[PDB]
Each structure stands twice: as C-alpha cells, then as structure tokens.
C-alpha cells in the first residue's frame, strides 16, 4: 500500500543513466524510454555517449533491463508483493555480484528515484580481470538474448530481499556463457516494506538496431511477467458474484425474447403493417442493430459499463410492458412514428446487454475464457429446454395480458438489483483503428463463417414449420420439440467443445474449419434431391437435425478466442477496450446473419422446393468453410521443432536422435542442443554455428559427439557411440528467432 501505486499505471516515462569502469576502461550510456505495469512491456532506446563499446551489448543488457525492474506486470494474488512497486518516490538501490565461468567479474550498485512523473536509473560497475582474446573481448557474442527466470526470496534482517539469476549468453562459436547473477535489494528510505515470499520473474526480451541512430545503441522491447504462488484451486466468492449476474442476465431476457416472436400475427394485421411494413421491421431489425452494437463497441470506454449494462435491461424492462395491451388505441395518427417505437428498442435493449456482458465476462477469467461463455451457453440451453411449460396456468388467469405484466415485474424487479456487480471505473480508448481491425485478412474470413453460421439458423427457424406439415403432418405443439433436440445437442456442445478449447490453443483452428466442414454435411441431408432416393424417415431427420445442433454448438464457441488471439498477436491492445471492440464485433457480425440468410432463402422456398432451397444454402456454408484452408494450410508459419530418436539403450553403445524444424530457414541461424538430468537443471551440450562450418561441444562429450545438420529438410541429427550410465536424460533442441523456442524433447535411458 503506497501513495504512488494507484498512479503507477499508464506511460510512465524512464531516464536511464550509466557510467563504467571495466578493466581499466570508462564509458558511459544514456537513454530514454517508457513501459506500463499493466500491459508489462518495456521499450528503451539506449545510445552510448562515448563511442566503441569496449564490452559486447548483451553483457550489458542484464545490468540496464535488469536494473530497471520498477515495471513488473504481477498476477492477482501475487499484487501484495511488490517490493519493486513499494515505494516508487523515494528511490532504491540494488547490489549486484555477477561472475562468469572461470573469467573476470562485474560489481554494480544501482540508486533509482522517481521525481515528479519521471524516473531517473543511475548505474555504477566495476569490471576486473578480463582477457582479451577470451569469449568476451572477442566481440563473440551474438547479438540475441534469451529468456530467464530471475529467483526472489526476501530477508527481513536489512529488510530487503536477494535473488539469483543465471543467464545464457549465445557464442558466435555455438556455446553458451553462464552469468551468475546475486543480487542484493533494499529501499533507501524508511518507509513501509512489502516483503515478497518465494517467488520467480520471466523475461521476453528482443534486441534490435535502428539504423536512424548513427552512434553505438541498442533497442528493448522487455517483456516481464511474474508468477511463483500456486492459487488456491477454490473459485472465489467475488468472480461468482459476477457469473451469477451474468446468468440471470442470458436467463431472465430469453423467455420475453422468444414469445415476443410468435407473438406479432396476433396484431400484424390489426396495426395495417403491409408486407413492405413487416419487412422493413427486418430492415430496421438488421440495419440498426449493426450500428447501435457498432458504437456501442466503439463507445464502450467513453459511456462507461456499469450505466451501460444495469440500464442494458432497464430498457429490456420497458419493452416487456411495452406491449401491454396494444388492442386499446386506434393507433392511427400515432402509428405514423410508432413503426420504429415497435421492435427497435426491443433490438437496442438486447443488443446493448450481451455485447456488454461478453466484455465483462471475458475481463473476469482470462484463463477460462471459452469456458465460462459456454458454461453461460448451456444454461441457456436448459433454460430454452424448460422454457415455456409453466405457462399452463398463469394467462389462463384473467386474459391474454398476464405474460407481459407478471414476467415483465420479474424482469423490473431484476434489473435495478445488477447495481451491486460492477466495480469497474475505467480503461484507455483504443489508437488503432477499428476498420484496421476489420481490415486484417483473418476476421476477414472468420466473418464470413459467422454470417453464415447465423444464416444457417436464421433459414431453418421458419421453414420446418412450413415443411413437415406435407409429408409428415405433425401438429404446431410438435413443431417446437424437434427444435428442442437440437437445443438439446447445442447443450451438449456448449461446455464439451469449449473447455477442450481451452486445453489446446492451436488446435482450434481445424476445430472451426471441421465444424463448418460438417455442417455443410448437416444440411445435405436435410433436404436431399430425391436423386438420392432416401425415403423421408422421422429418425434420420431427427438425427441430422442433432448432429446440425451438435456442429453448430461445436462451431459457435471457438470464435471468440480465435479473435482475441488474433486482435493480440497483431499488435493491437491488451485491455477492456479491445475486448469491448471485439464483442461488437462479434454481436454485429452475428446480427447482419439475420438479413443475409431469411430473406434470399425464403424468397427461394417456394420458387424452387426445400431440396434445392436448402442446397443453395448448404453449398454457401460449404465454401464459406472451405475459404478457412486457403489461409490457414498456406501460412501455417508458426515456429515448431520435432524431436524423436530416443529408446532404451543397451548400456555402452551407439544410437543417434533427431529433430527436425518448421517455419523458419536455417540459412542465416544457429541452433543448440541441451540435456535435462533426473533432478539437476539444464545443461548446454551441442551447438551448430550459423556458417556451420564450426561447432561447440561440451567437454564431458567432446570426442564422442558428432552434430550433423541437413538444410535441405531442416532436419538435425546428433549421433554418438559409447554411451554412460548417466546418460539417462531428456534432450531438447533449441533455436532463437525472435524469441527462445524449444521442442519437446525425448528420452535416452542408459540401463
């Protein structure tokens, strides 16, 4: 708890300073830059104001990163433990020891003070015993840098803590150079010490040159992130307290929103709506609902969400009495401006709860987020299923008014009580475009699936009803139950196909591509040429019509994280508006399905049959679906590597393991191998320089390893002979572009 931790957040800009006394040789570096806490990131332009380093740049990258660990993004049950976001207006220092295997050694001491809005680094080191024709002075650093795990424990008798970190500096020769890293932490002023427990920090870090900076520089773009506490695995009272709220707001809507439908022919005729007024009630239903929810995600930030969803209903609550008895008034001079006062509002009042609904429910649980909107899901479903059988009773009491007046105090009464929920006060409004967002060629066919997916039910809804009556003849009370089945089967995909979305991120892809695949299936059946010649049988309509719902269920879920991982890797925000934006998105891409499909399919109904009728349609879903490959299995360029080749070993021997590589070149790029021990950290074994022509082996194999690489394939082989009883470990295969990535990695067992 300090003054200055609710103004942390935000830019916060960073001047860094360095002066330097390594081996008898001085130079200094200054530079500017800003980060966030709440996004994590850490961008810093540093420029040597002396001239030639006498070090190489990575050496110093764990003394002016490292240093500056003030912007430490912290998970939730880990924000009490900040001792780097203690007290920022009075400063701290850190002492630093860092050896290097069997060479010289760094002793730095580092004073930070934040004045005004601005933080000021000063970083002082001392560097003693260097060689110049070593790994350091050689210049044989390559310019790239991993990621690290900094260790933090804290000791109350200097009330400050101390870490350790070792890091892996690449060779231009293939090995590595072991950093220890100490690190000694306390606070300058007298203040209130948050003492952390035992807990660890994650680097991401880039390195870059600008080719603008004439001088010596570098580039940062340092990710942090923090973990080190397990959570207890117990759902907390205050993220149900707002699931709960959530659920009465996809529950109590549902049953006002589905007997409004067939409730209009009870007046369509006594108001003098034409079949050019009934169908400018979709226009208007279509049209206003794509802008109200397109600046309603536009203007999520500046309305606010808290008047935005507990009135998202108030209005829901005027328009279940909004039809109260409308058989009173000759409406006539009143009709003239009630066309729009009928079903608009209806369409804003839903329009305006989920699209805010879907934001705060993503913001709760970004951990579970195709889990909860599919636990929302199936109970809808089971409210749906149960949905109008206790009606048997309450409008058989004193006429045809009772479902708006004693539903519609339910719904009264529920909306002023969502007012406890929210505690939400503000976010950033977002600098990127959002036709920038549309404009990126991924939603720009994921848009298509979905207008299709909503225009596959948005045909079949009035169309069984006018079907089965000729061949199958089934009363209108049956007309609904079929339907139900299929509700049945969205249950049954609401939960299981998202959870599992969950589990494995890059096999959602397929997973959309396979729904769309199948319910192009799921419609070829429904209506079949009788080319075919299948008879029509009730059951294997019913179960097409199950397997439709249980594709559709399976296709519907995975949209969402598909287009937040899309609106993230692409550079745009990491916050609550770019969630509000991509849930307008995705309730306006679902609300133009309700023009796109009823209306081309209904016309062709009766011009051409439900066989050919349902055709059309199943052949648009088939090529919507099938566009999904033509960007996805032609730029599957996602970093992997495979390794296999390891089994049980006849102790004293020969065998040899391989992995091969996909999505980069190795023309230009140097990759490493390491071993994994029962019960002892990592260890560098092999590594093959970028010109290959060299490679570096650990001294405990040398003699006895031999790396071998194929570009052709981009697949590498590490064979051996005369293998120990201690080579019983894991081996992985490691490369760095733009990023640390490692494979899997597979077993040798010596026994």
């Known amino acids: 708890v300090s003054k200055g931790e609710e103004l942390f957040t935000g830019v916060v800009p960073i001047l860094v300073e360095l002066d330097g006394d390594v081996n008898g040789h001085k130079f200094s570096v200054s530079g500017e830059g800003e980060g966030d806490a709440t996004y994590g990131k850490l961008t810093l332009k540093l420029i040597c104001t002396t001239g030639k380093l006498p070090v190489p740049w990575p050496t110093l990258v764990t003394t002016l990163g490292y240093g500056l660990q003030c912007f430490a993004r912290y998970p939730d049950h880990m924000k009490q433990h900040d001792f780097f976001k203690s007290a920022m207006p009075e400063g701290y220092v850190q002492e630093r020891t860092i050896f290097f295997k069997d060479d010289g050694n760094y002793k730095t001491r580092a004073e930070v003070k934040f004045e005004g809005d601005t933080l000021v680094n000063r970083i002082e080191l001392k560097g003693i015993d260097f060689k110049e024709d070593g790994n350091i002075l050689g210049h044989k650093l390559e310019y790239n840098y991993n990621s690290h795990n900094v260790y933090i424990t804290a000791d109350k008798q200097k009330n400050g803590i101390k870490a350790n970190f070792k890091i892996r500096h690449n060779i231009e020769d293939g090995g590595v150079q072991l950093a220890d890293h100490y690190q000694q932490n306390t606070p300058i002023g007298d203040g209130p010490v948050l003492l952390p427990d035992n807990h660890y920090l994650s680097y991401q870090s880039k390195l870059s040159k600008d080719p603008n900076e004439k001088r010596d520089h570098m580039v940062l773009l340092e990710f942090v992130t923090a973990a080190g506490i397990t959570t207890p695995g117990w759902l907390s009272r205050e993220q149900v307290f707002v699931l709960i709220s959530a659920a009465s707001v996809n529950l109590g809507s549902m049953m006002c929103y589905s007997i409004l439908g067939p409730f209009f022919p009870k007046e369509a005729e006594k108001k003098g709506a034409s079949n050019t007024i009934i169908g400018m009630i979709f226009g208007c239903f279509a049209l206003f609902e794509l802008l109200a929810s397109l600046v309603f995600g536009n203007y999520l930030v500046h309305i606010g969400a808290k008047f935005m969803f507990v009135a998202g209903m108030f209005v829901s609550g005027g328009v279940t009495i909004l039809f109260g008895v409308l058989d009173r008034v000759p409406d006539g001079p009143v009709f003239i401006a009630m066309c729009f006062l009928v079903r608009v509002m209806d369409a804003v009042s839903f329009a305006a709860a989920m699209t805010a609904s879907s934001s705060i429910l993503a913001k709760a649980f970004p951990n579970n987020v195709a889990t909860v909107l599919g636990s929302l899901e199936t109970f809808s479903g089971l409210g749906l299923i149960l949905g109008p059988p206790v009606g048997g009773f309450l409008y058989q009491s004193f006429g045809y008014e009772v479902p708006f007046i004693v539903l519609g105090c339910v719904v009264l009464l529920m909306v002023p009580l969502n007012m406890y929920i929210l505690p939400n006060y503000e976010s950033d409004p977002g600098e990127h475009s959002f036709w920038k967002l549309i404009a990126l060629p991924k939603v720009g066919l994921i848009a298509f699936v979905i207008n299709s997916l909503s225009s596959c039910f948005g045909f079949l809804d009035p169309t069984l009803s006018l079907f089965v009556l000729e061949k199958f003849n089934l009363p209108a009370g049956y007309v609904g139950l079929v339907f139900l089945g299929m509700a049945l089967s969205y249950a049954i995909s609401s939960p299981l196909f998202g959870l599992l979305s969950d589990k494995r991120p890059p096999l959602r892809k397929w997973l959309l591509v396979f729904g769309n695949l199948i319910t192009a299936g799921c419609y070829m059946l429904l209506g079949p040429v009788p080319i075919l010649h299948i008879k029509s049988q009730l059951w294997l309509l019913v179960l097409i019509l199950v397997v439709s719902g249980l594709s559709a269920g399976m296709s519907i879920i995975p949209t969402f994280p598909e287009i937040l991982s899309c609106a993230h890797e692409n550079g745009f925000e990491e916050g609550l508006s770019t969630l509000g934006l991509v849930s307008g998105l995705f309730s306006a891409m679902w609300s133009i399905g309700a023009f796109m499909g009823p209306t081309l399919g209904g016309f062709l109904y009766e011009k051409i049959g439900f066989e050919w009728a349902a055709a059309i349609q199943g052949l648009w879903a088939l090529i919507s679906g099938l566009a999904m490959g033509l960007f996805y299995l032609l730029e599957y360029s996602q970093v992997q590597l495979v390794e296999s080749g390891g089994a049980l070993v006849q102790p004293g021997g020969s065998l040899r393991l391989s992995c091969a590589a996909s999505?980069?070149?190795?023309?230009?790029?140097?990759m490493r191998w390491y071993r994994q021990a029962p019960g002892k950290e990592r260890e560098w074994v092999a590594g093959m320089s970028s010109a290959g022509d060299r490679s570096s082996y650990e001294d405990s194999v040398k003699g006895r390893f031999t790396i071998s690489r194929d570009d052709a394939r981009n697949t590498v082989y590490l064979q051996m002979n005369s293998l120990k009883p201690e080579d019983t470990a894991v081996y992985y295969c490691?490369?760095?572009?733009?990023?640390?990535?490692w494979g899997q990695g597979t077993q040798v067992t010596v026994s």
């Open positions: 490691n490369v760095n572009v733009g990023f640390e990535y």
């Open positions: 999505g980069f070149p190795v023309n230009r790029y140097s």
